[PDB]
Amino acid sequence: VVLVNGGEPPNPLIPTGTNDSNGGRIIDRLFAGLMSYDAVGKPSLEVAQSIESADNVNYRITVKPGWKFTDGSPVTAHSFVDAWNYGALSTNAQLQQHFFSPIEGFDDVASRTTMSGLRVVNDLEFTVRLKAPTIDFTLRLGHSSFYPLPDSAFRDMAAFGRNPIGNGPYKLADAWEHNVRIDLVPNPDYHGNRKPRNKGLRFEFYANLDTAYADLLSGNLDVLDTIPPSALTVYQRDLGDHATSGPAAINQTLDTPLRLPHFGGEEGRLRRLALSAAINRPQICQQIFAGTRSPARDFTARSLPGFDPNLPGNEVLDYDPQRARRLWAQADAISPWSGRYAIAYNADAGHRDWVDAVANSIKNVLGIDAVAAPQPTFAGFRTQITNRAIDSAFRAGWRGDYPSMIEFLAPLFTAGAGSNDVGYINPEFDAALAAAEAAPTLTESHELVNDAQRILFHDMPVVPLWDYISVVGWSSQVSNVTVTWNGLPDYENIVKA
Structure with missing residues (x-):
């Protein structure tokens, strides 16, 4: 056997x-x-x-x-x-x-x-x-x-x-x-x-x-x-x-439900963009993963058909502490930040070192109480996310089911999808994905999926971290x-x- x-x-x-x-x-x-x-x-x-x-x-x-x-x-x-x-x-x-x-x-x-x-x-x-x-x-x-x-x-x-x-x-x-x-x-x-x-x-x-x-x-x-x-x-x-x-068609994200305190509406959009600018993806990929993670350039994975690492608006995934603080301050003008930012993870799959590094980066850049919060099993962790009992941010990630960029976005970011863990809803994005699916050719479909990703760079529904080696x-x-x-x-x- x-x-x-x-x-x-x-x-x-x-x-x-x-x-x-x-x-x-x-x-x-x-x-x-x-x-x-x-x-x-x-x-x-x-x-x-x-x-x-x-x-x-x-x-x-x-x-x-x-x-x-x-x-x-x-x-x-x-x-x-x-x-x-x-x-x-x-x-x-x-x-x-x-x-x-x-x-x-x-x-x-x-x-x-x-x-x-x-x-x-x-x-x-x-x-x-x-x-x-x-x-x-x-x-x-x-x-x-x-x-x-x-x-x-x-x-x-x-x-x-x-x-x-x-x-x-x-x-x-x-x-x-x-x-x-x-x-x-x-x-x-x-x-x-x-x-x-x-x-x-x-x-x-x-x-x-x-x-x-x-x-x-x-x-x-x-x-x-x-x-x-x-x-x-x-x-x-x-x-x-x-x-x-x-390279494998697998990614990792930092998910912050829109229902958490300080993480809904415009305030939440500015805070997610701030978290993204507060994480040094190349540095974590080099030092935590010994080169076996590639910094995210989009919401899919670099090994998929049609992937483009140079999409307009992808600078939201660049490390920029000054930008992170400016965004966090704009969010604080809507409602002042309070409390803790905790990143839940399943400890069975070796996520400890990266989640510690990401929490430490957010704490140091933004000057907030950010911590890692381990749970022992994937099964328990996923159960908490699915029933919405989870009361913090949490790690997430997608392993492709078939090699299609649309397959990395429809299940996670469309209004009705069962794997939309954060409660993101943008009808304009759902319509852009339907346009991509309806394209007369594969080349045109890839262009339209990448056009649809501009909406995701704006809303930052989750924070894309890296793709897998x-x-x-x-x-x-x-x-x-x-x-x-x-x-x-x-x-x-x-x-x-």
Whole structure:
């Protein structure tokens, strides 16, 4: 069995209910959707036989015959349409609801329980009608929001999330020791694009990334996808040709909910711009991350298609203490600052050193009580953010689901999105993103997404910090280790001697 790092999923293992990378790395082993992604994020037909559109509005999707879930029930057009309707319907409160927003009839469900734009034709064909041309519709159909579900899921979704049944390359060993590990074995029914080259996976849920690194060194862990900052000056000596580094489509942000004291309206906008000017991204990237973080130049990631590091208005992400103080003073003229600025973080993923450095920078530049506030587990941390119980700023960050800049902005900054943790609402931004999605070409779409980012430079909904250089290490027992475009191991292709 290949031993790899992970963490406890904050939510049950329902694809439309999963918006985080701890649940996501598990769900993506268990299901197969219309398309699958290879290690560079390129989609290929998987469960779909064909996807046809002449107008880029009406899609006819034909399903390959003979696919089944591990409970023996068939994968059909109904398996997709029922899952997608389940995801879109507001009554089911699914975190991935916004991924269905381009489909005609989404507005009715987000008395109707189904989207008029989704129509089953027969067991192996269905049609999708979009409200408009949507540039990353085809590309998105490998994402977990679009996975199919078995008939038994809809009879009891809570039971399903504790014990999911899928159609993908792996299945749960039967498996999930809460806060300890989850065990997966190959699915013998699966004959798709991602056939496993190993006899199973064990995701170990480390309390401490320093422990995970010790386990890698001793051969008690096969793959470690996050070298902790404590090891970034020693890993190359320690692992040699058994560690690989490279840009990944992953970013980090400092999120300050607009509902906190002194952080709403114009006062909050000026304060966020001040915080951004009070952080020296190049200095933290050099000294805390040993060069394995690249300063943010926008709200997405430098390795994505269409990324531009020279957008007009990007100077809001430059270190400028004089500007930071001037902005903070203008905010204080609306309402005088009081109290503490606390940055909450999950301590299990090695964020301590950077959050300490950012708090210290804010305290020293602005002359305020800024501190770091650790929490022990990602799952607890994310739960606090989602139910809005959290009463401070907090770290956040996005791991791309598919290589599309629009995918790094729509889930976080549109009014209705489930991953909009701060309560940012700017209808002008939502409209600019819809314009980008409707562009006649990819080049024009990238230009319009970058035009839409000018609104984000003005409002600073969150503070973009940096993008990732992934560093992944592995044991002498495994080979064929490829790191994907979003920094994860290519799990199905890991071979164990």
